[PDB]
Scaffold this active site. Structure first.
Site, PDB file in Angstrom:
ATOM      1  N   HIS A  40      31.302   3.923  -8.374  1.00 45.20           N
ATOM      2  CA  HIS A  40      32.389   4.306  -7.487  1.00 45.20           C
ATOM      3  C   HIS A  40      32.996   3.104  -6.777  1.00 45.20           C
ATOM      4  CE1 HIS A  40      29.657   4.723  -3.850  1.00 45.20           C
ATOM      5  NE2 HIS A  40      30.782   4.373  -3.255  1.00 45.20           N
ATOM      6  N   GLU A  52      26.003 -15.187   0.489  1.00 46.41           N
ATOM      7  CA  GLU A  52      26.687 -14.867   1.729  1.00 46.41           C
ATOM      8  C   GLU A  52      25.720 -14.458   2.826  1.00 46.41           C
ATOM      9  OE1 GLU A  52      29.558 -15.221   2.679  1.00 46.41           O
ATOM     10  OE2 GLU A  52      31.102 -14.745   1.197  1.00 46.41           O
ATOM     11  N   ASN A  54      27.316 -14.512   6.812  1.00 47.28           N
ATOM     12  CA  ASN A  54      28.528 -14.064   7.490  1.00 47.28           C
ATOM     13  C   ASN A  54      29.657 -14.015   6.464  1.00 47.28           C
ATOM     14  OD1 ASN A  54      30.961 -13.928   9.038  1.00 47.28           O
ATOM     15  ND2 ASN A  54      29.779 -14.528  10.822  1.00 47.28           N
ATOM     16  N   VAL A  57      32.923 -16.150   7.335  1.00 49.02           N
ATOM     17  CA  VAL A  57      32.828 -17.578   7.630  1.00 49.02           C
ATOM     18  C   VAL A  57      32.202 -18.268   6.434  1.00 49.02           C
ATOM     19  CG1 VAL A  57      31.847 -19.346   9.158  1.00 49.02           C
ATOM     20  CG2 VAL A  57      32.528 -17.082  10.085  1.00 49.02           C
ATOM     21  N   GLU A  62      27.653 -20.388  -0.243  1.00 44.76           N
ATOM     22  CA  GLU A  62      28.304 -19.370  -1.048  1.00 44.76           C
ATOM     23  C   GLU A  62      28.676 -19.865  -2.436  1.00 44.76           C
ATOM     24  OE1 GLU A  62      29.432 -20.533   1.942  1.00 44.76           O
ATOM     25  OE2 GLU A  62      29.672 -18.815   3.279  1.00 44.76           O
ATOM     26  N   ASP A  84      25.971   6.910 -10.939  1.00 44.75           N
ATOM     27  CA  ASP A  84      26.806   6.016 -10.125  1.00 44.75           C
ATOM     28  C   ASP A  84      26.305   4.575 -10.256  1.00 44.75           C
ATOM     29  OD1 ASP A  84      28.714   5.086  -8.410  1.00 44.75           O
ATOM     30  OD2 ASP A  84      27.830   5.972  -6.592  1.00 44.75           O
ATOM     31  N   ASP A 171      19.960   4.554   8.344  1.00 45.51           N
ATOM     32  CA  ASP A 171      20.556   4.926   7.062  1.00 45.51           C
ATOM     33  C   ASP A 171      21.470   3.798   6.600  1.00 45.51           C
ATOM     34  OD1 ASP A 171      21.283   6.577   4.853  1.00 45.51           O
ATOM     35  OD2 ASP A 171      22.427   7.981   6.116  1.00 45.51           O
ATOM     36  N   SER A 172      21.852   3.851   5.321  1.00 45.77           N
ATOM     37  CA  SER A 172      23.001   3.083   4.845  1.00 45.77           C
ATOM     38  C   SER A 172      24.278   3.837   5.215  1.00 45.77           C
ATOM     39  CB  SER A 172      22.886   2.768   3.346  1.00 45.77           C
ATOM     40  OG  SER A 172      22.767   3.930   2.572  1.00 45.77           O
ATOM     41  N   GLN A 174      29.050   3.653   4.935  1.00 48.46           N
ATOM     42  CA  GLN A 174      30.246   3.171   4.249  1.00 48.46           C
ATOM     43  C   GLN A 174      30.303   1.650   4.303  1.00 48.46           C
ATOM     44  OE1 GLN A 174      30.536   6.160   6.042  1.00 48.46           O
ATOM     45  NE2 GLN A 174      30.885   7.249   4.105  1.00 48.46           N
ATOM     46  N   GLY A 175      30.654   1.037   3.176  1.00 47.93           N
ATOM     47  CA  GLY A 175      30.649  -0.403   3.050  1.00 47.93           C
ATOM     48  C   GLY A 175      29.370  -0.981   2.489  1.00 47.93           C
ATOM     49  N   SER A 177      27.846   0.686  -0.036  1.00 47.75           N
ATOM     50  CA  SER A 177      27.795   1.216  -1.393  1.00 47.75           C
ATOM     51  C   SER A 177      27.723   0.100  -2.413  1.00 47.75           C
ATOM     52  CB  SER A 177      29.017   2.084  -1.680  1.00 47.75           C
ATOM     53  OG  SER A 177      28.902   3.325  -1.023  1.00 47.75           O
ATOM     54  N   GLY A 178      26.956   0.353  -3.469  1.00 50.15           N
ATOM     55  CA  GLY A 178      26.760  -0.609  -4.532  1.00 50.15           C
ATOM     56  C   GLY A 178      25.638  -1.584  -4.275  1.00 50.15           C
TER      57      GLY A 178
HETATM   58  N1  LIG Z   1      24.805   8.043   4.431  1.00 49.01           N
HETATM   59  C1  LIG Z   1      24.744   7.161   3.462  1.00 49.01           C
HETATM   60  N2  LIG Z   1      23.586   6.677   3.090  1.00 49.01           N
HETATM   61  C2  LIG Z   1      25.936   6.691   2.804  1.00 49.01           C
HETATM   62  C3  LIG Z   1      25.966   5.758   1.698  1.00 49.01           C
HETATM   63  C4  LIG Z   1      27.261   5.417   1.284  1.00 49.01           C
HETATM   64  S1  LIG Z   1      28.389   6.256   2.267  1.00 49.01           S
HETATM   65  C5  LIG Z   1      27.199   7.035   3.189  1.00 49.01           C
HETATM   66 CA   LIG Z   2      30.116 -16.738   4.301  1.00 45.71          CA
END
Ligand SMILES: NC(=[NH2+])c1ccsc1
Ligand SMILES: [Ca+2]
Length: 223
Positions: A40, A52, A54, A57, A62, A84, A171-172, A174-175, A177-178
């Protein structure tokens, strides 16, 4: 990552940032030429950013390398997020060092209760929005399949597992992912989806990498 901690610079040396003008997903370096991420997260024009901490910066460790090809899993279903997973080939091989390192693929699946390390540059708030510049980390156990399927009735396939805390708070998000879920030194998960972030009885859902090892190995050997 919600409820985690600052990893420390380059302490997760297989973690990559996928950049298309901005960070949009994580990934994991699996050899000098190849990255694993979530299907996704697919888009054209990806630059892989290795070494990476930061992401805003240039700190000096890097490597920025364009993708030459992406391969989304043949059975990826964008409606349900089943399968996925994608592979990204680097246009030039990464220069491996202590801060840019590959993570091993599983030789078998991991058990419920195994502790894993989940990392990324995603949102750190469960209500609202705050993005870190530096990499965040979370230690979290694999949850039983019954607790996973109970949280997400009708949505969990054998290609997914849950990890985290049913009480919420960690938890993980948004951002992230992957990005990686590493357990006992193996890449067992890819950050995939969830309901909100860090909500009670809604743990994170992760792509079950151990089901894909043959596909990964055969695909990279043929591409
Ligand atoms: N709640 C999560 N773990 C999650 C992972 C990607 S978007 C939300
Ligand atoms: Ca950097």
């Amino acid at each position: 990552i919600v409820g985690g901690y600052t990893c420390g610079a380059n302490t997760v040396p297989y973690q990559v940032s996928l950049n298309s003008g901005y960070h949009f997903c994580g990934g994991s370096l699996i050899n000098s030429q190849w990255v694993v991420s979530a299907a996704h997260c697919y888009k054209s024009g990806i630059q892989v950013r290795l070494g990476e901490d930061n992401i805003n910066v240039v700190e000096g460790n890097e490597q920025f390398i364009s993708a030459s090809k992406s391969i989304v899993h043949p059975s990826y279903n964008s409606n349900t997020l089943n399968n996925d997973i994608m592979l990204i080939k680097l246009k030039s091989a990464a220069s491996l060092n202590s801060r840019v390192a590959s993570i091993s693929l599983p030789t078998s699946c991991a058990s419920a209760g195994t502790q894993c390390l989940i990392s990324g540059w995603g949102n750190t708030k469960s209500s609202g929005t705050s993005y870190p510049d530096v990499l965040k980390c979370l230690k979290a156990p694999i949850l039983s399949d019954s607790s996973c399927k109970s949280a997400y009735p009708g949505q969990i396939t054998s290609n997914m597992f849950c990890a985290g805390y049913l009480e919420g708070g960690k938890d993980s998000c948004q951002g992230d992912s992957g990005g990686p879920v590493v357990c006992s030194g193996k890449l067992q998960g890819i950050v995939s989806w969830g309901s909100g972030c860090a909500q009670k009885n809604k743990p994170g859902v992760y792509t079950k990498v151990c089901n894909y090892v043959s596909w990964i190995k055969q695909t990279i050997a043929s591409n």
